[PDB]
Amino acid sequence: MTDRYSFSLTTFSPSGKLGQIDYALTAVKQGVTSLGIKATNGVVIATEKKSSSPLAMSETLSKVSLLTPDIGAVYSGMGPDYRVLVDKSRKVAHTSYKRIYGEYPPTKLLVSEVAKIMQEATQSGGVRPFGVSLLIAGHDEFNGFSLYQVDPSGSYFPWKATAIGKGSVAAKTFLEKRWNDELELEDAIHIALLTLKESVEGEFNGDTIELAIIGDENPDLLGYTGIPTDKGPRFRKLTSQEINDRLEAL
């Protein structure tokens, strides 16, 4: 009982590196490839659903998660570390923002918050950094569409497009070639589907690919009618069926 490690487990070495942070990034490296692409009328985040034995139900694992009705997150690295960050992130979006201003936070500020949770694990006593890197995609009235990457150190930066994990280096290259600032959303989805075909070994279909968009408002996904002043959440998880349809014309 009681914590006896009240000191930082992440300290500077003589060369200036922070060991545990580096190793966290090494953990992220082995992680499955994931990517985000920013269009003019949307953002796409996508990843592979590496099933451990076909007896496992792929749908029951959330690799792409709604954080707020306009913000989503995807990851590379350690799944368990991601799951808790999502919960803490959802809750902090409420306690630090919605319960104060009565509106969901803008993308850059939620990211700022997740980054804080992660930085703290970089410095607090008795803890290791999170072994994940996140890609957070969202829309807010004043900043429009955005995409951010958050790393184990709690550092974050915005991207027009990027990828993280195993086949990241190769995918960043693939995206660099295919990205222009005039892409519709369907184009970005197509580019994302292409980029993700490089990383995957075996089966490549809608039941092995998780993919979500931040697009237009979906009024029928709101749950109620009568306050015409929101046409619903901008976040949408593409269905297994919807993915396969864009694979036939690939």
Binding site: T10, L18, Q119, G154, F157, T162, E176, W179
Partner: protein, 235 residues
């Protein structure tokens, strides 16, 4: 937070070592303004430059900081420095004197140096500020919790090369426009890139605001850096 046989602070020295690898930031102080310039560390074409901030932060309306080190560690310290400024304004109905805020942040750093068994913040700051006691002020703080005031200073990568060049071309009676010029020139020669482009730069000035008698903070837009890069003969 332990002492070496020599009398140095191990973790502090190592944090400074960390900073020495971070993108360079420069502060130059004119007679009628202060310049802040900073270089983004080896970036990419797909990195968003528009909605991006990583090296230059607004503390209040009269003070800004240039960051060299761990972006996240700086976000923490930035935000409590923003709070300290607001606490002071509430208590006294006057904006915080630049030094007082700088001392307070430096004290926070000093804490992680003496007690608690937590790692220092791997962050160095350049503070550019104005107040009505001391006019324009340029300050520097590092992991050791030490702070000093400057006419021109640099932090992060290649500070030796940068310091020499600034000592060569700086003189007390400069204008802000020449300080902007000097800032870019110095970074031009201490870069680890081919040349210096607009998308690898953050730029801010604290001027006496054209015509008013009031103080103005300008965080240069991407396109505005591109412009200021042309006139000074770098395109």
């Amino acid at each position: 937070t332990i002492f070496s046989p020599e009398g140095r602070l191990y973790q502090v020295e190592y944090a400074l070592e960390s900073i020495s690898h971070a993108g360079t930031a420069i502060g130059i102080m004119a007679s009628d303004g202060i310049v802040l310039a900073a270089e983004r560390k080896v970036t990419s074409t797909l990195l968003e430059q528009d909605t991006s901030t990583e090296k230059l932060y607004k503390l209040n309306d009269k003070i800004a900081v240039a960051v060299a080190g761990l972006t996240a560690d700086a976000e923490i310290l930035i935000n409590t420095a923003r709070i300290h400024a607001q606490n002071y304004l509430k208590t006294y109905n006057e904006d915080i004197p630049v030094e007082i805020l700088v001392r307070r942040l430096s004290d926070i750093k000093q804490g992680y140096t003496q007690h608690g068994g937590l790692r220092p913040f791997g962050v160095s700051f350049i503070y550019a500020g104005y107040d009505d006691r001391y006019g324009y002020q340029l300050y520097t703080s590092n992991p050791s919790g030490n702070y000093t005031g400057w006419k021109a200073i640099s932090v992060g990568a290649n500070t030796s090369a940068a310091q020499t060049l600034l000592q060569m071309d700086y003189k007390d009676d400069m204008k802000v426009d020449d300080a902007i010029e000097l800032a870019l020139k110095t970074l031009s020669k201490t870069t680890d890139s081919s040349a210096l482009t607009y998308d690898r730069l953050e730029f801010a000035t604290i001027r006496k605001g054209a015509n008013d008698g009031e103080v103005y903070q300008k965080i240069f837009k991407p396109q505005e850096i591109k412009d200021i890069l042309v006139k000074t003969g770098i395109t």
